[PDB]
Symmetry: D2
Subunit: 57 residues, 4 copies
């Protein structure tokens, strides 16, 4: 896995999103995906493919 | 309609979300729903029933 | 507008989705977007840019 | 965990959703959540709290 639980990540491009890794998913379309809880909006989680995300400090 | 385009709203409870009304939807489950663009995460939009949202200054 | 309320649409590519137009949204990232209620999963709605969708019979 | 990868589940109420468990997430709001890939709409995944889902054959 590219990321681990608790890593701070953001969307690289397009629609913005930033916060902590809180889970994972795997489909044929998205064989490595992550759930990210917004640091701005507690409790709201969105899922993205790994290629859409980057780790930040 | 309870809200109009550009109103600043937030989720009342549970998962947080805050930003501008940017659209509308209507289903039998949700006969009055709104699309809200996050003010923290430009470009990210989430849809909610009217009962889940409140207008703020 | 490309689509109207009640049009049957689908995602063109990638993640699948199919059902009726039930609303609209507009942001700078997505100046023409639509809400689509799944015909398979009543009550579940997802929003997409117009370029991601096609009308079907 | 209540569910495992590959279990067939559905939403119990409200907005419908049905398909296979494809991942997991954990937040304070949702300490046990699951990602479910629709069986009707390949590639589309939605996340829900465990209490919202039930396993089916």
């Amino acid at each position: 896995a590219t990321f681990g639980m608790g890593d701070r990540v953001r969307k690289k491009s397009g629609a913005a999103w930033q916060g902590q890794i809180v889970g994972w998913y795997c489909t044929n379309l998205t064989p490595e995906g992550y759930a990210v809880e917004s640091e701005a909006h507690p409790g709201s989680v969105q899922i993205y493919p790994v290629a859409a995300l980057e780790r930040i400090n």
